[PDB]
Design an enzyme around this catalytic site. Structure first.
Site, mmCIF file in Angstrom:
data_model
loop_
_atom_site.group_PDB
_atom_site.id
_atom_site.type_symbol
_atom_site.label_atom_id
_atom_site.label_comp_id
_atom_site.label_asym_id
_atom_site.label_seq_id
_atom_site.Cartn_x
_atom_site.Cartn_y
_atom_site.Cartn_z
ATOM 1 C CG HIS A 10 -14.790 55.699 83.834
ATOM 2 N ND1 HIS A 10 -14.996 55.480 85.166
ATOM 3 C CD2 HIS A 10 -14.933 57.047 83.322
ATOM 4 C CE1 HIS A 10 -15.149 56.699 85.570
ATOM 5 N NE2 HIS A 10 -15.295 57.687 84.545
ATOM 6 C CB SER A 14 -13.896 60.075 86.328
ATOM 7 O OG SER A 14 -15.276 60.075 86.396
ATOM 8 N N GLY A 15 -11.801 58.786 88.738
ATOM 9 C CA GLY A 15 -10.328 58.358 88.875
ATOM 10 C C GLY A 15 -9.929 58.675 90.110
ATOM 11 C CB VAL A 48 -0.821 78.964 86.742
ATOM 12 C CG1 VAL A 48 0.169 79.757 87.033
ATOM 13 C CG2 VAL A 48 -2.000 79.663 86.086
ATOM 14 N N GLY A 102 -15.408 64.880 85.535
ATOM 15 C CA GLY A 102 -13.799 65.335 85.521
ATOM 16 C C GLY A 102 -13.233 65.059 86.868
ATOM 17 C CG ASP A 126 -14.372 52.473 86.762
ATOM 18 O OD1 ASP A 126 -13.616 52.505 85.773
ATOM 19 O OD2 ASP A 126 -15.295 53.468 86.724
HETATM 20 CA CA LIG Z 1 0.281 74.044 87.705
#
Ligand SMILES: [Ca+2]
Length: 223
Positions: A40, A177-178, A57, A175, A84
């Site tokens: 996904h 996910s995966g 950074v 965020g 998935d």
């Molecule tokens: Ca960095």
């Protein structure tokens, strides 16, 4: 990650960030040229970012490598999130060191009760939104299949497991996910889905990597 802790820079050396102008998903480095993530998370134009802690950074240990090929599982179903999982090939091999390292694939499936480490740059709040710059970590157990199916009637396939806390408060979130679920030094899960984050009786659901090892190995051998 809701309810976790700051991992520390480069303490999760297999964690990658998928970037399309911004971080959008995690992944795991499984050898010098291949990453595994969630289907996904598919999109075109992925840059894989290795060696990251603060994703805003440049700290000195990063490697930024474009994807050459993405392969979504042949049976991925975006409506149910069954299967998935995807593979991403890097345009060139990463340079492996103590801070950028691969994670081993499992030879057996992990049992309920096993403690695992989940990591990511996702939202840290269950209500509202706060995205961290640095990598967050959570230790959580695999839940029994019976508990998982009770929490999500009609939605859990043999390719999924639940991990976390039925009381809520600690979970993966948007965020994440995966990204990886690592247990006893092996990649056992991929952050996949849930209902909200950190809600009571709604633990996170993870792709069960041990069911896919044959497909992963044969795909890498041929691509
Ligand atoms: Ca960095």
């Amino acid at each position: 990650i809701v309810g976790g802790y700051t991992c520390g820079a480069n303490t999760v050396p297999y964690q990658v960030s998928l970037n399309s102008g911004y971080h959008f998903c995690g992944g795991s480095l499984i050898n010098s040229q291949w990453v595994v993530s969630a289907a996904h998370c598919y999109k075109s134009g992925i840059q894989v970012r290795l060696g990251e802690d603060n994703i805003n950074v440049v700290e000195g240990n990063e490697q930024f490598i474009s994807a050459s090929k993405s392969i979504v599982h042949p049976s991925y179903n975006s409506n149910t999130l069954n299967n998935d999982i995807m593979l991403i090939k890097l345009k060139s091999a990463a340079s492996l060191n103590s801070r950028v390292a691969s994670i081993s694939l499992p030879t057996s499936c992990a049992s309920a009760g096993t403690q695992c480490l989940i990591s990511g740059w996702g939202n840290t709040k269950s209500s509202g939104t706060s995205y961290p710059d640095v990598l967050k970590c959570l230790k959580a157990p695999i839940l029994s299949d019976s508990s998982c199916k009770s929490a999500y009637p009609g939605q859990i396939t043999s390719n999924m497991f639940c991990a976390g806390y039925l009381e809520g408060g600690k979970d993966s979130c948007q965020g994440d996910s995966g990204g990886p679920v690592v247990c006893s030094g092996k990649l056992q899960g991929i952050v996949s889905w849930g209902s909200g984050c950190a809600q009571k009786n709604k633990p996170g659901v993870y792709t069960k990597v041990c069911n896919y090892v044959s497909w992963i190995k044969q795909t890498i051998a041929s691509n």
